[PDB]
Every structure is written in structure tokens, then in C-alpha cells.
């Protein structure tokens, strides 16, 4: 009918429009412009199970003289998603002399999130929580099999040799209570206690996000 | 002596990032991150538009995308950019036309100085 | 206005929680007075525990007196005193590796996680006195116990932050592990009860939970475990059971406790 | 549904080309 004419019609204009819209977008962007993310970001695109890290290790070692002071990780786990077996043979005692670890463990996995930082040479001396917020101001309660789930636990190694100049002692504090942003988007007060924790240090992350770049942090992810 | 990032991270993007992520001097490519995962127009790719344009009509990009950019490209996006090198917002009258790289630089830029005086230039797109 | 404030909101579970009065009766507790519990033999004073609760107090510094890794060790747990239940015990950020090492060693399997936010009541008024500046010269304790709070809005500057090496301590917790059995099942009642509230506190005492935060972990463990609870069929074989008990709120219907050196 | 498209938290690109979808569809079943 000329109905389906009017609504050919009709898409013709957001056809325009939304052309008008792309070509504005890639005008920008082929001009001074810059996005989120800040410059002093090194992102990586790499699986880690196919990630050579002796490069990286060769690479830290010549650009900055010493090896990383924090390997915060955020592990998917099966309960995409990888085994426990190749989080556990990962290269993380070859890449840390004297710093910490963040793990970012579930309910689910803090055992096994223990043991395995006690097996790669850390010793448990710490815990950070992230208790959920609402926009009111109240708890953001969930779900779970014996008590309704409403936190989230990060678990802190050490090692070495960490009582230095570098990094500071009895800072920040174990829990972060802010909103849930995001899917599954950890708050930017973690790092604001990180770099509280060791200011000017070089980081390391694995399993990042596009949404977590920092400007001091080696990242390294797959959607990166 | 304390260490500068700027440097350190231009170092370190050199030969630990990709070369969509970080650019020649080892600086940050934002347009990398403006768009999304997959999504992100190389200089490559638009080399292989511009090859296939030199090799190929305009209009039939069926064997471009085949044989061209990966096998599996984006016709949608091939028809955009094609429009955008060009300078004009609909190429009807390029339909089946193949043109070189010099004419293809001076008929873009006939059609700017044709759309300069016109008030036609919105954001580098020549309407008609 | 009233009621609307971060701090007097996160509160307001302290209204329902009130403590109860004593039992009167003598056949609705246990009362158990011994030497050395870690050198005590449970198995003979009670028999199958579905929530054993240990009111430890760890020793962590040099000079701090309380109970240590080596104190647990000692602590024997049979089948005949727990064969189907949960643990309940005060764990510690310095000893959570030991502390699970050693219960993993008795068969106790770690399953959930319970803490209390930790809020200073010192810290309230020395806030307020900084904002403000009628009522606000009293004591930090008497606000607890008249439940006369200052208004807060951000509550993250309210936080007990007790000193450390590392980020500064500031919550309690509780950790759950239970005795999977095979054979028998287990009663239980899911999801009754938040893993989370908020609780005041004292700057000199980050330590002791308070009256109605004692009273609503009870009330957690009592809503988990149903059929644990006081009832006629349960004389004489009470379910739950105290470790390191005190006289501050264990008397209690249903409930066996266990003391150390009266 | 095109209003569904149109508001939807598709990027620009992801948007035309389901635009162009839609109208080679109608396209197609007017002409034929």
C-alpha cells in the first residue's frame, strides 16, 4: 500500500540522518579528539594463556630498570571463561620481586583463590571487600544459598622485600563502599587505594576492561 | 633519579602493544578506542578501498569485499566510506564509473570547491 | 530531615533487634563451666551440635591477650560432638589462611562469609563537632546506649580504621564453614538474612560487637537452622553450642555454652 | 521495529546497516 511508500520514506530520512550523524562522527575523529582512555595507558591484545610474557619481562626490564609493584587480576572463572589450571600455571612469580597481588575472588572461588596465591609465593596479609550501594543510600542486597549475597572480596599478597621507601603503610581502608556500575565494573576506588598504596609505581593488570585503563597501568585483556 | 611515564609508556606501547593501538612514534591511538571491538577502519583498510576503487567500478563492492579487505567485510560501511573519500553524500551518478587515484583526489576536491561556494560543506559532505 | 540520613537509615535494623531477658528456667540451657577448653572433651558434655559458634579472641600482636592458631589446634572436634552443622568463628585478615587450613584439617569445608561494618561512634561526634561547629558533649557510649545518633551523610569518613601494616582495618568477620554429611541432611532456611550490616562501635574498642549486633547474629544463626531452635523435643539434646562463651548475652533458650576458667 | 532501533544503544554503524536491512526487505516485498 502507500503505507509501506510513507514508511519507506521514513526510513529514507533516518537513513540521511543517521549518515549525517556517522559523517559528522568520523570527521571528529579524523581531527583533534581524544577518547577516555589516557595516553600514558599500555593496552594489550592478548590471550594470556597465548601471551608470551618473557617479552614482557624483557621489555619492563630495559624501559624501566626494575619489575612491577602491583598484578591486580580479575579472574573469569568457569562457575570467555577459563579453567582454574591455567590460572594456576600463569607466570606470576616471574613477574613480581617485592610487591603485592589483587585477586578479586567470588564467594564461589575464595579458597581455591587463596591457595592459589599461597602457591605462587605470596602470603595472605590482606583483604579488601566492596560493599554494593544504592542510589538512596542503602545496601544493595542480592541472592545466595545460605545468607543474601551483597559484597564482593578481594584478597592481598606479598612478597618480598616491601618494607622500602616505595610503599606506604597504614593507608585507605579494606572497605569500598560505592555503587554498582557497569556489568561487571569494579569502582575506581580501588586504584585510587593502589596508587595511594605505592604512588609512582608501574602496575600490571590482567583480564582488563576497556573501562578500567589507567594512565600508569600496564593491561593486558582480550577485548582490550 | 625518578623515571618519566610519558617516555616510559611510548617505550613500552613500541614493542609491547599492537599497531592499530599505539601509532609510529609510539603514541596513543584514540581512534582505536572511539569505536568499538572489531569495528575500527585501518589505514590498510582504507588503502585496499582505495586499491579496490583503482582495480574495480564503484558501486559493486561484491568482489572487493571477496577479495579485497579479508573476505568478510561490511557493505554498509564500504558504501560510508566510499561516500566520505569522495566528498559527496550520494555517488548515484558514480554508479558503475572506476576512477584513478589522481582523478579520484581532484574530483573529491572539485566537488569541495563546488560545494564551498554553494553553503552545501556540512562537516567535509557535499549534499544534492 | 529525620530518617533520611546515610547514618540513621543504615541503622534502623536496631529497633527490632532487642535482646532478650534471661531464661529463668533451668532445663532451657546447658551453662558449662571448665578449665581448658582446647584440653576439654565436648563429646561427653554435648551431643550432635547443628551450630557451633567459637567466641574467640585472637592473639595477634605481641603484647594482645587472647587465643592463637596453636590454641585451635589443641581444640578437638569429633563426629560425636558435630557431624552435620556449621562453624561460626571470628576470623582475622593476619591468620585467614591458617585458620582455614586448620579447620579443612577437621573436615569443615568453608561455604559463606558474614562481617559487620564497623562504625565509630567517636568519629560521629568529632565529625559533628567539626561540621557544626548541644548534645553532642556527652560520652561516645551513652549514644550507643540511648541510640541518640549525630546525622551522617557520607558514612565512608565514619569508619573505624584501627592501625595496621597495610590498609587500615576496618570490618569484622565472621566466617561459616560446615561439616558436609552424607548420609543425613541438614535443615535450613535460605536466604533470611543480609551478609552485611552496618553496626556502631567504639574507636578504643574495635573488638566487641555490641548488645544488638551479638543479638542479631544470634537471630542470623537461629533463622539458618530452624529445627536447632529451643522446642520440647529438644530438652536435653540442645543443637547449638558455645566456645569461649561470656556472660554478656549466652545464657540463651536452646543454647549449650561452654566457659573458660570462671 | 525501526523506533526500536532508532533508540536503542546501538552505535551509528550497527544502526544504518540494520537500516538498509529494513529497507531492502520492504523494498523487495513492495516491488515483488
Known sequence: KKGLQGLLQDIEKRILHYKQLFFKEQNEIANGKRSMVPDNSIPICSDVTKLNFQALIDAQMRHAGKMFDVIMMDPPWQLDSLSDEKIQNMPIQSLQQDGFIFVWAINAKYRVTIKMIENWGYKLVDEITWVKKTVNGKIAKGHGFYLQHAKESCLIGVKGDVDNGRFKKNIASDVIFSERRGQSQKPEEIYQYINQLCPNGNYLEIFARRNNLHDNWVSIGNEL | ?128 | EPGEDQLSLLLKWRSSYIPPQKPTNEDEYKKIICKDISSEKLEQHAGDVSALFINIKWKLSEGQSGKSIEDLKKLAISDKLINNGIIFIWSEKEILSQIVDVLEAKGFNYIENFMINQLSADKALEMQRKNQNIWSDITPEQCIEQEKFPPNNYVQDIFVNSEYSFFRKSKKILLMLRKFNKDAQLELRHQRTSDIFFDIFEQNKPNDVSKKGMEFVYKMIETLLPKANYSEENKGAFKMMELYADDKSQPRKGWISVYEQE | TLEDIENEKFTNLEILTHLYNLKAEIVRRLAE
Open chain 2, 1 to 128: 633519579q625518578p623515571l618519566d611515564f610519558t617516555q616510559y609508556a611510548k617505550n613500552m606501547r613500541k614493542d609491547l602493544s599492537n599497531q592499530d593501538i599505539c601509532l609510529e612514534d609510539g603514541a596513543l591511538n584514540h581512534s582505536y578506542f572511539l569505536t568499538k571491538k572489531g569495528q575500527y577502519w585501518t589505514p590498510l583498510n582504507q588503502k585496499a578501498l582505495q586499491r579496490g576503487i583503482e582495480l574495480f567500478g564503484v558501486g559493486n563492492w561484491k568482489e572487493i569485499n571477496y577479495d579485497e579487505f579479508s573476505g568478510k567485510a561490511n557493505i554498509v560501511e564500504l558504501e560510508l566510506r566510499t561516500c566520505m573519500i569522495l566528498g559527496i553524500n550520494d555517488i548515484t551518478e558514480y554508479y558503475g564509473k572506476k576512477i584513478s587515484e589522481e582523478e579520484q583526489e581532484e574530483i573529491k576536491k572539485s566537488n569541495i570547491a563546488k560545494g564551498k561556494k554553494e553553503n552545501k560543506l556540512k562537516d567535509n559532505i557535499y549534499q544534492k
